[PDB]
Amino acid sequence: NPIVDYEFNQDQSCLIVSTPKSFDIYNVHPLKRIMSQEMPDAGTIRMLHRTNYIAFVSTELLHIWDDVKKQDITRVKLDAAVKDLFLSREFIVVSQGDVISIFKFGNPWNKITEDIKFGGVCEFANGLLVYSNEFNLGQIHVTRLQTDAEQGVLVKAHANPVKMVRLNRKGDMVATCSQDGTLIRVFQTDNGVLVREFRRGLDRTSIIDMRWSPDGSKLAVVSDKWTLHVFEVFNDAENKRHVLKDWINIEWSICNFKLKVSNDCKIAWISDTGLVIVWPNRRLADTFKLNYNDDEHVWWLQLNQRNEIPL
Numbered sequence: 001n002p003i004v005d006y007e008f009n010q011d012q013s014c015l016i017v018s019t020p021k022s023f024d025i026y027n028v029h030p031l032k033r034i035m036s037q038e039m040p041d042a043g044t045i046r047m048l049h050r051t052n053y054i055a056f057v058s059t060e061l062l063h064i065w066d067d068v069k070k071q072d073i074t075r076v077k078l079d080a081a082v083k084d085l086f087l088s089r090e091f092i093v094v095s096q097g098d099v100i101s102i103f104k105f106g107n108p109w110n111k112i113t114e115d116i117k118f119g120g121v122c123e124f125a126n127g128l129l130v131y132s133n134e135f136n137l138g139q140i141h142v143t144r145l146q147t148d149a150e151q152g153v154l155v156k157a158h159a160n161p162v163k164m165v166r167l168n169r170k171g172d173m174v175a176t177c178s179q180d181g182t183l184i185r186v187f188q189t190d191n192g193v194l195v196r197e198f199r200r201g202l203d204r205t206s207i208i209d210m211r212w213s214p215d216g217s218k219l220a221v222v223s224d225k226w227t228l229h230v231f232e233v234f235n236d237a238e239n240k241r242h243v244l245k246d247w248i249n250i251e252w253s254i255c256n257f258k259l260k261v262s263n264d265c266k267i268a269w270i271s272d273t274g275l276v277i278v279w280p281n282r283r284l285a286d287t288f289k290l291n292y293n294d295d296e297h298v299w300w301l302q303l304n305q306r307n308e309i310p311l
Contacts, residue, residue: 001311003280005045010125012211012268013050015278017309018042023056024311029270031285031307037067048087055092057082062094064109074109086124090147093124100131102145113151123174125167128189130174137161138178142189155192157185166219168212173233175212181205181223186233198231198251211267215239220275221253226261228277228301229253230290257288257301283309 006017014034016025023042025035044057054065062076080097087093091112092103100116103109118141119132127146133139133154138161143152158178166175173195176185181204186196200207205223212219217239221229232254237244259277268276273290287305292298 003283005043006266006278006280007046008266008268009047010049012270014047015268016045016047016054018045018056019311023054026309028268028276029274029287031309033310035067044082044085046085046087048089053087055085055087057085062092076103076109083120084122088124088127091124091145093129095120095122119161121162121165123165123167126169126171128167128171130165130167132162140165140176140192142174142187142192153192155187157187158183163207164210166210166212168216169214170216173212173216175210175219177207177210179206181207184210184219184221184231186219196233196251198253200229200253201225208265209267211269213269213272215272220267220269222259222265222267222277226259228257228259228288230255230299230301255299255301257303260303283311285309
């Protein structure tokens with residue numbers, strides 16, 4: 001009945017959840033369920049695009065499910081409690097305890113390099129790994145993974161320790177924030193160079209979620225103050241990579257929205273002007289429109305719709 005874990009597609013096309021009895025997978029826009037599979041002990045739950053493969057943690061090892069023939073194709077023994085889990089067509093990436101482990105996806109599913117001590121914050125997306133330093137928690141590591149190996153880069157990102165971290169779809173940019181929740185920063189992943197800095201507000205908050213638009217142009221952000229912020233990271237020209245003269249020649253949300261609330265959530269971009277917020281406790285999916293007046297050059301958000309999540 002209740003919802004144990006939940007996560008999006010790499011795409012945000014779908015949302016997967018686990019209850020005590022099951023794991024279910026939905027379409028995000030619009031919300032109807034696609035699939036339901038009964039299962040005990042489904043905990044931390046992840047999918048792989050829209051492929052037939054799903055991973056979950058028994059509640060202590062890692063089941064790799066194949067939904068065609070309906071069976072584990074492997075179980076993987078885990079040393080510690082699990083925090084984060086990422087699938088790629090050639091890596092399974094797991095943060096357990098105080099270490100990040102990386103297995104081969106397929107094959108003998110072996111452990112392809114040495115467990116990684118990290119400060120407890122990490123993302124993996126499209127071949128790129130970001131994690132805080134074991135000791136200076138406001139520092140960040142960024143490195144590409146390669147088969148054909150060759151089995152990275154180190155960024156001083158925040159004064160206070162990193163809260164979370166969020167790659168954009170292509171992989172070239174990562175967003176950061178700290179337990180301060182005031183400054184939000186963006187780095188080129190080729191080299192860890194600060195690209196752009198923003199302000200959420202003046203007081204301190206903890207950021208619940210951040211996400212990029214398919215575009216790569218914008219970033220959504222939600223603080224426990226329950227205000228949704230959108231930032232314009234790059235405008236059209238900046239983004240399409242044009243020239244811009246007088247670029248050389250000698251920042252806040254473009255819009256925000258106060259949320260309707262009664263503790264945690266996740267944001268999906270269903271389009272380059274639409275978002276969905278998911279609330280686990282209420283099993284509820286808010287959909288927001290992102291409007292633009294081109295006479296003035298201004299943006300506003302509205303809340304189109306609230307749909308209950310069928311279980």
